[PDB]
Amino acid sequence: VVINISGLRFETQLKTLCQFPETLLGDPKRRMRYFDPLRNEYFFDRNRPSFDAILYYYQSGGRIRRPVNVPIDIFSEEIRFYQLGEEAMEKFREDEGFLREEERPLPRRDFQRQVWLLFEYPESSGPARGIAIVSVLVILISIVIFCLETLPEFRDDPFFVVETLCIIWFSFELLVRFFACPSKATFSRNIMNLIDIVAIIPYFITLGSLAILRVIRLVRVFRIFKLSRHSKGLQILGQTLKASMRELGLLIFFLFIGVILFSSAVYFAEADDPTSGFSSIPDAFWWAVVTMTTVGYGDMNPVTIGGKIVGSLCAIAGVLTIALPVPVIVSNFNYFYHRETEGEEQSQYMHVG
Amino acid sequence: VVINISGLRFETQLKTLCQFPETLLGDPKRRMRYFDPLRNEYFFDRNRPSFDAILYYYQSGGRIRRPVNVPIDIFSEEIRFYQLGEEAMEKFREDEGFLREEERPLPRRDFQRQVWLLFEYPESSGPARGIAIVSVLVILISIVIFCLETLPEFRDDPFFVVETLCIIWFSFELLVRFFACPSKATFSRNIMNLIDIVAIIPYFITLGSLAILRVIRLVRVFRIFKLSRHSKGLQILGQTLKASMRELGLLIFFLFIGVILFSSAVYFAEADDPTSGFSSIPDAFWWAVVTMTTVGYGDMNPVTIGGKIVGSLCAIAGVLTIALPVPVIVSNFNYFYHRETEGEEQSQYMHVG
Amino acid sequence: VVINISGLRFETQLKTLCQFPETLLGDPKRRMRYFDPLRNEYFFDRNRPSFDAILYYYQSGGRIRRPVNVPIDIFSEEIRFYQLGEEAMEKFREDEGFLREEERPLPRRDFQRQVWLLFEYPESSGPARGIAIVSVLVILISIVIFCLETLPEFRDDPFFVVETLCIIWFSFELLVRFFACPSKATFSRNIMNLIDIVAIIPYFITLGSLAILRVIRLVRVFRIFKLSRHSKGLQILGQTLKASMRELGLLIFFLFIGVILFSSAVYFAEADDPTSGFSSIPDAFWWAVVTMTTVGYGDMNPVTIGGKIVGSLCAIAGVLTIALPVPVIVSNFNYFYHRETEGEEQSQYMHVG
Amino acid sequence: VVINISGLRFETQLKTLCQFPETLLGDPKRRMRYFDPLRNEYFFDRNRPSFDAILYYYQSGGRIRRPVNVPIDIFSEEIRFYQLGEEAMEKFREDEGFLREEERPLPRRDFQRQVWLLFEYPESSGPARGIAIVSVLVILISIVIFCLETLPEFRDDPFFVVETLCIIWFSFELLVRFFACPSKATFSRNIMNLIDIVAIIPYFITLGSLAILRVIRLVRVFRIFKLSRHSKGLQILGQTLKASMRELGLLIFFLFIGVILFSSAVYFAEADDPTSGFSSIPDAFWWAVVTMTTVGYGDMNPVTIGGKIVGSLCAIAGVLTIALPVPVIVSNFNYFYHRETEGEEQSQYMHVG
């Protein structure tokens, strides 16, 4: 068969177009209105370079590309015009990277679907927005009273009666969601819900082993992580830290080679001095990590020229061990920034049509 | 109809070309001189790949692209040759990003249009350039006498008779523009003119509540912002700070998570020491912000190994919280640098033709 | 001859296709089944833009390109379909950069090929993985006892009986590979094997000139480099340091211009002060290197305004001398990261077919 | 006329090809051997996409592009095959950026052209390489004796008899080039030769006003700049500093806004404290420049919370004022690195053919 896309002749076999017998070109009654019985061809008055990837979809047997010149709002119309189907439309989706939104879990009630739209979806309604302005205020007061409790003018109980205001309110915002979810096993895997409970598990022990009395106080600071729910930027931070496992491990490892190698070199170049502040290898560990990171503290300083040549080569190599696996992390942060701020806003406006 | 662009056959319907009945291809008396009655086609001896985007303009119904291979001085001629009109020429403008220059407000006088070309447009004439060499000298002396007034050899009035020289000259450069503008409501929105007046409002109170006597002195430093008018680079800085609102907010927020999380960790790892300099959580706030930024001050130092493992993980994570939203800011600065230094100089030389 | 690649007419001479008389198009009995005796041409129903680089392979006489639009899994099939041969397939290999894997040296035995697959190839079998979990544990204990030996609570012999456990185990892991290799001259060039022996050469002198007693202790730290064998990331670090010879030399040279030029400027601007801490040019060398690297130590500080203007211009220029040859190094690290993690996994899945 | 580039039909007028009546297509006796009297066309068996830019050269009237897909060693052959001439070949040169090498000034003698190839061209011959190994040794000794002269164990004359060895040798390497050049006005503009003489002008005053006795000593350090002649990397540094005038000025200006604005804010937030180390605005200038650059010195520290909030906002904004005009400088350094190391080595191997 011969197809004439506004002047460009594409000519393929008939059994290639019969592989997909539900599309425009596969159905002999839908493409029959585009025939041209004077030249024995089908004439479409469409975009020229967009058909080079439509014909390759039939030839390869199912793959969908996108040519570089044609934009996404143009190529999303040719799949809609040639009637390739939603199977081929969704295969165009993840090829561009934009994954479709997952279906929310419906609990199938009217009391339960209302309270699900009341708290977990704060953007929808009025009292949905009413909790969100106080779910920032309840968190910020709890972190700052945890700071104000540690202030030593009071340490070195009205400070108990102000913190129970925030914690039963923390318990208020959890007991309204303990019974209001579609599922319960999926409740125990979502890390948004996984730390919230840990905030109460450390307080319920307090009303009813010194090392244990301190450990708990450390978990009380976890309440900072509750800000991740209603803050859009932290998920971009949360996904970048969670997609960069094997690159973050190389960041702390590449300096650990530089810690041991340079603490030994500053030691043996200053072992022949009684006034040397570096007593041993764990003594000069803090010097080796404060010079490679280019902070500097000045507690332990080399004095001789043999020890002033290793730290100068330590600070130079200290940049060249920490700035090497960094720029893949700032690119992953740019990916989750560009697939949340203008990723789906430009995709789903012309991907769902 | 068949169009033959120097060997490449483009073939579209007649009602597609009749959508725009004022262009070259739409008018049956302007395209009639390009006919070829031996082959029944129109023959243009033009550039080949530039017509693929001209024909798509008719087919889509008004959109203008630009193919990647053809440069801007070539594609700006094909819109001029096919006579697509200024409506289609200006639709090509903002597609490339280069917005046209806005019309200046004409006050419609001869006394007023002369003084408008005298001060606000310093590049035009001689006395237009005469004020610009002294509108740098009047500003630099006022900031440095504000510095020299604060010098304590004189603090701990001939210093009044030197600062009134600059301020009535500041008032000279404002009263010549109070009455010389096209409009007055547009006068009160332009931020160039919005701070200039604030420079006098803080001085006129002085000739005619201790906290109030200090606040005013703080506004006197605002006179630095008057340098933004005649300096080309500060608008590139001013637009980059003003186009990066939601990214600058994430920069100060991502360290605020790192301030509280790391000040608690250095506290509880050093709470069991009487010689620990960290008294409390606001006490070690300054330590937490000076280590993540990699400055270091040395006023408060961890001494034990349990406290020397958190600051080493603080400085490493301190780079990975502040360098993440930075590279979008240095790209926006590159955009306003490339759309002011070679943006309009390459555009309007071939966009207005 | 005329070749019709699904609508696109390619037309070349016959002696061009006869340059390679073993391919599809060169053999008059293999291409004869694609003939079309009504139009006098050969009709292939293949991808359109992939044949523009197949025909140029015949015309140029052997070169293989790849067009930008067609991906690698598509263009690797057209070389497989047109039967260009493995000579042309391997010429496509290094054009994409992906070099094929070299053949391992076979020692041609059954005792020797088994022990070669036992230790040097730890990913293969069970006891191949059994040594790898203890070849990390034997190394980490040896570096930390070298740290613990230097701790001065014991310095200022049961610490001999714990280090011989690691060293005969180091000798265990070398004597199993002294006699188990295909070759011996290739044994003495591989830098993985070149430092391992140096670890014993410094210990065998110890059981059987003070400067010599210290030098040896410095080589004992070399045992850190033994971690490079079973760690995947260090080869990416090792290749980036070994491919950047002339760029690393310019990094230490560009600051050496800044060391001498700025130590002289801080000297002569502070030579007229008796309280100046800078005694001479090697005295202020440590100040010049700690300011350009932005660490800061505070041992020697300028006090006057003439000396506070050079260090402010030193720290500004100190970034602009060290950050200039850095970004080619972080790009080379990205190349060896992308040719080891997804380089050969995407290449050899469709390069060897 | 119709031109058939191996299957692609290009069809232009005859007067377009007659604009350049010396090329292949312009001469009716050179293109006559490519005619095809059965189809009435010219048949070239060349590369297909390379002719789209050859035909546009005739149509536009002289411009030469290069299409993106075709590499430089391919497109440099089509200009050689179609015989466009060296006028069109050199117009292809600077379009790719690679400027041709300038002709060296010939003094037209045999004594003078020999000594010109003896010293200024050290790569050519044996004694041309003989001076280059001692023109590094004569410079390095002169900078280090200028360092060793300033050492105070000798200050606080055999050190005169060692420095005259280097200076008459400096005079040896200048008097051999005073009389050995093609021109003398071009001698006084080349900045390589402009500082060399300044090295003697400061020594000839010494053998034959205290401020003048110190100034000279400062110029003696200029001898570092003599290393730029035989060092390949410094010209890449020298061109990057000399092509970035208006960007380097914005680097020192953007912090000068941050110096005055933040020194005033730290002053007025600490003016109500008698223990505040910041006496005045020039007193806290050194604090403001050491925090934005992230060095830190610790001489003057804020103590109150009102002064600990400005320096935390100073160090954050201090990165965002200095890292903004930096990445255009590291790109210019990459341009002069890629046009000196692989720029002309890949160009002139196929640009001069």
Swiss-Prot record, chains A, B, C, D:
Residues 268-308 are extracellular. GO terms for cellular component: axon; membrane; perinuclear region of cytoplasm; plasma membrane; voltage-gated potassium channel complex. It comes from the Eukaryota. A lipid is attached at C181 (S-palmitoyl cysteine). A motif (Selectivity filter) lies at residues 294-299. Residues 181-191, 232-247 are cytoplasmic. Activity is up-regulated by JAK2. The modification Phosphotyrosine is found at Y349. One of its GO terms (molecular function) is delayed rectifier potassium channel activity. One of its GO terms (biological process) is action potential. N-glycosylation promotes the cell surface expression. Phosphorylation on Tyr-349 inhibits its channel activity. The chain crosses the membrane at residues 130-148, 159-180, 192-208, 213-231, 248-267, 309-331. Keywords: Cell membrane, Cytoplasm, Glycoprotein, Ion channel, Ion transport, Lipoprotein, Membrane, Palmitate, Phosphoprotein, Potassium, Potassium channel, Potassium transport, Transmembrane, Transmembrane helix, Transport, Voltage-gated channel. The N-terminus may be important in determining the rate of inactivation of the channel while the tail may play a role in modulation of channel activity and/or targeting of the channel to specific subcellular compartments. The segment S4 is probably the voltage-sensor and is characterized by a series of positively charged amino acids at every third position. Homotetramer. Forms heterooligomers with KCNE4 which inhibits KCNA3 activity by impairing localization to the cell membrane. The stoichiometry of KCNA3 and KCNE4 in the heterooligomers are 4:1, 4:2, 4:3 or 4:4 respectively. Increasing the number of KCNE4 subunits steadily slows the activation KCNA3 and decreases its abundance at the cell membrane. However, a single subunit of KCNE4 is sufficient for the cooperative enhancement of the inactivating function of the channel. Interacts with SEC24D; this interaction is reduced in the presence of KCNE4. Belongs to the potassium channel family. A (Shaker) (TC 1.A.1.2) subfamily. Kv1.3/KCNA3 sub-subfamily. This is Potassium voltage-gated channel subfamily A member 3. It comes from Homo sapiens (Human).
